[PDB]
Design a protein around this motif. Structure first.
Motif, PDB file in Angstrom:
ATOM      1  N   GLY A 114       0.793  -1.212   0.000  1.00 41.12           N
ATOM      2  CA  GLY A 114       0.000   0.000   0.000  1.00 41.12           C
ATOM      3  C   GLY A 114       0.829   1.266   0.000  1.00 41.12           C
ATOM      4  N   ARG A 115       1.769   1.369  -0.935  1.00 40.02           N
ATOM      5  CA  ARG A 115       2.678   2.509  -1.018  1.00 40.02           C
ATOM      6  C   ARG A 115       2.794   2.934  -2.476  1.00 40.02           C
ATOM      7  NH1 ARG A 115       6.264  -0.552   1.665  1.00 40.02           N
ATOM      8  NH2 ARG A 115       7.897  -0.037   0.145  1.00 40.02           N
ATOM      9  N   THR A 116       2.067   3.972  -2.866  1.00 44.80           N
ATOM     10  CA  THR A 116       2.194   4.483  -4.221  1.00 44.80           C
ATOM     11  C   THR A 116       3.515   5.236  -4.344  1.00 44.80           C
ATOM     12  OG1 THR A 116       1.240   5.937  -5.885  1.00 44.80           O
ATOM     13  CG2 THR A 116       0.852   6.481  -3.604  1.00 44.80           C
ATOM     14  N   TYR A 120      -2.473  11.834  -7.899  1.00 46.49           N
ATOM     15  CA  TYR A 120      -3.420  11.922  -6.796  1.00 46.49           C
ATOM     16  C   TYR A 120      -2.687  12.039  -5.466  1.00 46.49           C
ATOM     17  CZ  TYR A 120      -6.798  10.572  -3.299  1.00 46.49           C
ATOM     18  OH  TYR A 120      -7.591  10.536  -2.179  1.00 46.49           O
ATOM     19  N   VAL A 121      -3.191  12.916  -4.598  1.00 48.42           N
ATOM     20  CA  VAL A 121      -2.500  13.257  -3.358  1.00 48.42           C
ATOM     21  C   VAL A 121      -2.978  12.406  -2.187  1.00 48.42           C
ATOM     22  CG1 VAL A 121      -1.838  15.555  -4.058  1.00 48.42           C
ATOM     23  CG2 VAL A 121      -4.090  15.195  -3.137  1.00 48.42           C
ATOM     24  N   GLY A 122      -4.273  12.442  -1.892  1.00 53.03           N
ATOM     25  CA  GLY A 122      -4.754  11.706  -0.742  1.00 53.03           C
ATOM     26  C   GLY A 122      -4.124  12.205   0.544  1.00 53.03           C
ATOM     27  N   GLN A 182     -10.273   4.683  -1.293  1.00 55.26           N
ATOM     28  CA  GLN A 182     -10.833   5.346  -0.124  1.00 55.26           C
ATOM     29  C   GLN A 182     -10.308   4.704   1.147  1.00 55.26           C
ATOM     30  OE1 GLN A 182     -15.059   5.108  -0.596  1.00 55.26           O
ATOM     31  NE2 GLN A 182     -15.095   6.431  -2.406  1.00 55.26           N
ATOM     32  N   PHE A 183      -9.247   3.916   1.006  1.00 57.39           N
ATOM     33  CA  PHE A 183      -8.595   3.285   2.150  1.00 57.39           C
ATOM     34  C   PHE A 183      -7.732   4.331   2.836  1.00 57.39           C
ATOM     35  CE2 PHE A 183      -8.898  -1.128   0.081  1.00 57.39           C
ATOM     36  CZ  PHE A 183     -10.104  -1.350   0.708  1.00 57.39           C
ATOM     37  N   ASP A 239      -5.780   6.026   6.265  1.00 52.67           N
ATOM     38  CA  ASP A 239      -4.848   5.457   7.225  1.00 52.67           C
ATOM     39  C   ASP A 239      -5.114   6.032   8.605  1.00 52.67           C
ATOM     40  OD1 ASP A 239      -2.699   4.145   8.415  1.00 52.67           O
ATOM     41  OD2 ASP A 239      -1.458   4.392   6.623  1.00 52.67           O
ATOM     42  N   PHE A 240      -5.541   7.284   8.650  1.00 50.22           N
ATOM     43  CA  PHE A 240      -5.865   7.953   9.895  1.00 50.22           C
ATOM     44  C   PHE A 240      -7.371   8.026  10.068  1.00 50.22           C
ATOM     45  CE2 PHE A 240      -1.537   9.111  10.124  1.00 50.22           C
ATOM     46  CZ  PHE A 240      -1.172   9.465   8.855  1.00 50.22           C
ATOM     47  N   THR A 241      -7.801   8.089  11.322  1.00 48.94           N
ATOM     48  CA  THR A 241      -9.218   8.155  11.610  1.00 48.94           C
ATOM     49  C   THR A 241      -9.809   9.416  10.990  1.00 48.94           C
ATOM     50  OG1 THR A 241      -9.133   9.460  13.626  1.00 48.94           O
ATOM     51  CG2 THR A 241      -8.560   7.139  13.776  1.00 48.94           C
ATOM     52  N   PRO A 242     -11.056   9.362  10.552  1.00 47.51           N
ATOM     53  CA  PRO A 242     -11.637  10.487   9.809  1.00 47.51           C
ATOM     54  C   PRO A 242     -11.778  11.751  10.636  1.00 47.51           C
ATOM     55  CG  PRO A 242     -12.903   8.474   9.507  1.00 47.51           C
ATOM     56  CD  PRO A 242     -11.985   8.231  10.648  1.00 47.51           C
ATOM     57  N   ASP A 243     -11.260  11.731  11.859  1.00 48.56           N
ATOM     58  CA  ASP A 243     -11.410  12.844  12.781  1.00 48.56           C
ATOM     59  C   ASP A 243     -10.131  13.649  12.958  1.00 48.56           C
ATOM     60  OD1 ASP A 243     -14.068  12.198  13.205  1.00 48.56           O
ATOM     61  OD2 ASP A 243     -13.588  10.837  14.861  1.00 48.56           O
ATOM     62  N   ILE A 244      -9.117  13.425  12.130  1.00 47.30           N
ATOM     63  CA  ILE A 244      -7.840  14.117  12.257  1.00 47.30           C
ATOM     64  C   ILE A 244      -7.730  15.166  11.165  1.00 47.30           C
ATOM     65  CG2 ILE A 244      -5.344  13.903  12.200  1.00 47.30           C
ATOM     66  CD1 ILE A 244      -5.721  11.059  13.297  1.00 47.30           C
TER      67      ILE A 244
END
Lengths: 77, 130, 22
Positions: free
Chosen positions: B42-44, B67-69, B91-92, B94-99
């Protein structure tokens, strides 16, 4: 202790003692896929970087410089 | 994961410049390869470039509209400084959607990055008091 | 995390010099 007071087993103090299973595997399968993804990413890829250095690293780092030197020196003559 | 993509990822990882440049050139004309492939781990390309701190490679990739993400967050988490400057001015999960970026920056003391974010202007929620 | 960067910098320098001389 807590789990013993959940089911409708006794429910009474002493003195007064006289689709569904084929389908639901799908969601749990999806959850396992996601959890394994998160774990393998964040536990054995980003925790394999903060370990430490030994001579097995120094030797490679030195020999790389030496090989580069040989290549450049030989190629210029 | 075609052999051209594997070769291109290896070129990015090792740090070769001409190879990746011509690969990005010849990728568009034929659409035979993808610049946004994903490694088995999982490393572009942008992630590994950020990890190795190759600013020239990073700018080259940025110019070709990759793409940045969560590359901004990944750079913040690894205290890279100049990469932050590059990544702001542009849409995977890595950090919780609250950061949010300021929060994760604050989690790891870094005066430079914090001072760089604050001038752009952000705020942190004040939780309800109990 | 430090060793990897220090190694790849040398590798990139090597590629640059070798390619530029031919």
């Amino acid at each position: 202790l807590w789990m013993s007071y959940f089911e409708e087993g006794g429910t009474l103090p002493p003195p007064f003692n006289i689709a569904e299973n084929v389908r639901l595997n799908h969601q749990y399968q999806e959850v396992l896929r996601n959890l394994v993804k998160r774990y393998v990413a964040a536990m054995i890829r980003d925790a394999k970087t903060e370990e430490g250095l030994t001579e097995e690293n120094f030797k490679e780092l030195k020999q790389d410089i030496s090989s580069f030197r040989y290549e450049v020196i030989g190629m210029m003559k | 994961l075609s052999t051209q993509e594997k070769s291109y990822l290896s070129a990015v990882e090792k740090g070769d410049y001409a190879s990746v440049k011509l690969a990005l050139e010849e990728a568009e004309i034929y659409f035979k390869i993808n610049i946004n492939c994903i490694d088995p781990l999982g490393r572009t390309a942008l992630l590994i470039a950020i990890e190795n701190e190759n600013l020239e490679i990073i700018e080259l990739l940025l110019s070709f509209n990759v793409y940045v993400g969560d590359a901004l967050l990944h750079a913040i988490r690894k205290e890279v400084v100049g990469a932050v400057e590059l990544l702001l001015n542009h849409q995977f999960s890595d950090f919780t959607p609250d950061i949010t970026p300021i929060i994760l920056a604050a989690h790891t003391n870094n005066y430079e990055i914090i001072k760089m974010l604050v001038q752009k202007g952000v705020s942190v929620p004040q939780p309800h008091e109990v």
